[PDB]
Design an enzyme around this catalytic site. Structure first.
Site, PDB file in Angstrom:
ATOM      1  N   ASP A  51       0.832  -1.206   0.000  1.00 19.93           N
ATOM      2  CA  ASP A  51       0.000   0.000   0.000  1.00 19.93           C
ATOM      3  C   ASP A  51       0.868   1.259   0.000  1.00 19.93           C
ATOM      4  O   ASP A  51       1.252   1.736   1.068  1.00 19.93           O
ATOM      5  CB  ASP A  51      -0.940  -0.041   1.204  1.00 19.93           C
ATOM      6  CG  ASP A  51      -1.982   1.055   1.185  1.00 19.93           C
ATOM      7  OD1 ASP A  51      -1.887   1.992   0.360  1.00 19.93           O
ATOM      8  OD2 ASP A  51      -2.925   0.965   1.988  1.00 19.93           O
ATOM      9  N   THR A  52       1.144   1.811  -1.193  1.00 19.64           N
ATOM     10  CA  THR A  52       1.923   3.051  -1.283  1.00 19.64           C
ATOM     11  C   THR A  52       1.203   4.236  -0.640  1.00 19.64           C
ATOM     12  O   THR A  52       1.837   5.263  -0.351  1.00 19.64           O
ATOM     13  CB  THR A  52       2.260   3.364  -2.756  1.00 19.64           C
ATOM     14  OG1 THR A  52       1.050   3.479  -3.528  1.00 19.64           O
ATOM     15  CG2 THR A  52       3.113   2.242  -3.363  1.00 19.64           C
ATOM     16  N   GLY A  53      -0.097   4.133  -0.416  1.00 16.11           N
ATOM     17  CA  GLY A  53      -0.822   5.213   0.215  1.00 16.11           C
ATOM     18  C   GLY A  53      -0.799   5.187   1.719  1.00 16.11           C
ATOM     19  O   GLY A  53      -1.389   6.061   2.363  1.00 16.11           O
TER      20      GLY A  53
HETATM   21  C1  LIG Z   1     -12.783   1.161  -3.255  1.00 15.10           C
HETATM   22  O1  LIG Z   1     -12.021   2.368  -3.331  1.00 15.10           O
HETATM   23  C2  LIG Z   1     -11.331   2.727  -2.227  1.00 15.10           C
HETATM   24  C3  LIG Z   1     -10.287   3.664  -2.339  1.00 15.10           C
HETATM   25  C4  LIG Z   1      -9.570   4.044  -1.197  1.00 15.10           C
HETATM   26  C5  LIG Z   1      -9.814   3.542   0.092  1.00 15.10           C
HETATM   27  S1  LIG Z   1      -8.802   4.050   1.526  1.00 15.10           S
HETATM   28  O2  LIG Z   1      -9.554   3.840   2.716  1.00 15.10           O
HETATM   29  O3  LIG Z   1      -8.362   5.398   1.344  1.00 15.10           O
HETATM   30  N1  LIG Z   1      -7.470   2.967   1.545  1.00 15.10           N
HETATM   31  C6  LIG Z   1      -7.722   1.519   1.599  1.00 15.10           C
HETATM   32  C7  LIG Z   1      -6.904   0.718   2.631  1.00 15.10           C
HETATM   33  C8  LIG Z   1      -7.516   0.841   4.039  1.00 15.10           C
HETATM   34  C9  LIG Z   1      -6.818  -0.732   2.204  1.00 15.10           C
HETATM   35  C10 LIG Z   1      -6.208   3.289   0.757  1.00 15.10           C
HETATM   36  C11 LIG Z   1      -4.977   3.572   1.685  1.00 15.10           C
HETATM   37  O4  LIG Z   1      -3.899   3.899   0.893  1.00 15.10           O
HETATM   38  C12 LIG Z   1      -5.253   4.816   2.629  1.00 15.10           C
HETATM   39  C13 LIG Z   1      -5.162   6.152   1.827  1.00 15.10           C
HETATM   40  C14 LIG Z   1      -5.217   7.343   2.759  1.00 15.10           C
HETATM   41  C15 LIG Z   1      -4.108   8.167   3.051  1.00 15.10           C
HETATM   42  C16 LIG Z   1      -4.197   9.238   3.941  1.00 15.10           C
HETATM   43  C17 LIG Z   1      -5.425   9.541   4.584  1.00 15.10           C
HETATM   44  F1  LIG Z   1      -5.551  10.531   5.420  1.00 15.10           F
HETATM   45  C18 LIG Z   1      -6.549   8.726   4.312  1.00 15.10           C
HETATM   46  C19 LIG Z   1      -6.429   7.643   3.414  1.00 15.10           C
HETATM   47  N2  LIG Z   1      -4.271   4.784   3.724  1.00 15.10           N
HETATM   48  C20 LIG Z   1      -4.567   4.961   5.080  1.00 15.10           C
HETATM   49  O5  LIG Z   1      -5.685   4.723   5.541  1.00 15.10           O
HETATM   50  O6  LIG Z   1      -3.566   5.409   5.898  1.00 15.10           O
HETATM   51  C21 LIG Z   1      -3.638   5.419   7.328  1.00 15.10           C
HETATM   52  C22 LIG Z   1      -3.133   4.069   7.812  1.00 15.10           C
HETATM   53  C23 LIG Z   1      -1.690   3.874   7.319  1.00 15.10           C
HETATM   54  O7  LIG Z   1      -0.813   4.860   7.836  1.00 15.10           O
HETATM   55  C24 LIG Z   1      -1.170   6.228   7.558  1.00 15.10           C
HETATM   56  O8  LIG Z   1      -0.979   6.605   6.196  1.00 15.10           O
HETATM   57  C25 LIG Z   1      -1.728   7.799   5.949  1.00 15.10           C
HETATM   58  C26 LIG Z   1      -2.836   7.832   7.047  1.00 15.10           C
HETATM   59  C27 LIG Z   1      -2.653   6.533   7.844  1.00 15.10           C
HETATM   60  C28 LIG Z   1     -10.860   2.590   0.160  1.00 15.10           C
HETATM   61  C29 LIG Z   1     -11.612   2.186  -0.947  1.00 15.10           C
END
Ligand SMILES: COc1ccc(S(=O)(=O)N(CC(C)C)C[C@@H](O)[C@H](Cc2ccc(F)cc2)NC(=O)O[C@H]2CCO[C@H]3OCC[C@H]32)cc1
Lengths: 99, 99
Positions: free
Chosen positions: B25-27
């Protein structure tokens, strides 16, 4: 380009005539952008993430230019904390993970 | 390996003697795993995502084997819907984005 991950993989995008920054997000199935003005019809949708669900507006066949690459597809608009480019668009610009 | 994004980029990981599947998860800044039993001491923490925040237990200096690559670092454990490998560990296995 090749992007290492010591920092957040942010890119500049152009969508609906506006310039924004967005995260290249391999963990996101769909593309989700912060509240913004997008033209045309839309359908309500609910998507789930780490902390629960948000209501978004679903726009189909939307053109985005992601770091200079054009793609057309579904864009969700709503109360995401960050602009997210998901796999539905990453595949169109040829994005891969490599290790 | 090179991984395209037409499907979720899932890999097999071994952590705390157990086998699991996790999303590259690059995000994600940090690594967040579904509820599981890990040995050491920990620290409570809160993390935010698309739908709000969750309470997690932070474990430092945890060894993880990700697709046969070893990494050591912080793992968060709590009510995430999916096991996520974040950038804190992606950098250690040399993962890059390419388009
Ligand atoms: C069907 O289409 C969809 C498209 C996107 C999402 S989703 O909820 O966005 N997700 C899915 C994950 C849970 C499988 C992408 C993820 O990359 C997310 C992206 C993101 C970034 C920053 C944010 F503020 C909010 C969201 N990461 C994240 O929750 O990060 C948290 C935990 C990790 O550590 C930190 O990183 C940053 C914040 C902390 C669901 C369904």
């Amino acid at each position: 380009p090749q992007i290492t991950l010591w920092q957040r993989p942010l890119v500049t995008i152009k969508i609906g005539g506006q310039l924004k920054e967005a995260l290249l997000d391999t963990g996101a199935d769909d593309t989700v952008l912060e509240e913004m003005s997008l033209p045309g019809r839309w359908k309500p949708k609910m998507i789930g993430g780490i902390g629960g669900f948000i209501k978004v507006r679903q726009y189909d066949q939307i053109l985005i230019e992601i770091c200079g690459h054009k793609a057309i597809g579904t864009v969700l608009v709503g109360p995401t904390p960050v602009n997210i480019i998901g796999r539905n668009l990453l595949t169109q610009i040829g994005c891969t993970l490599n290790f």
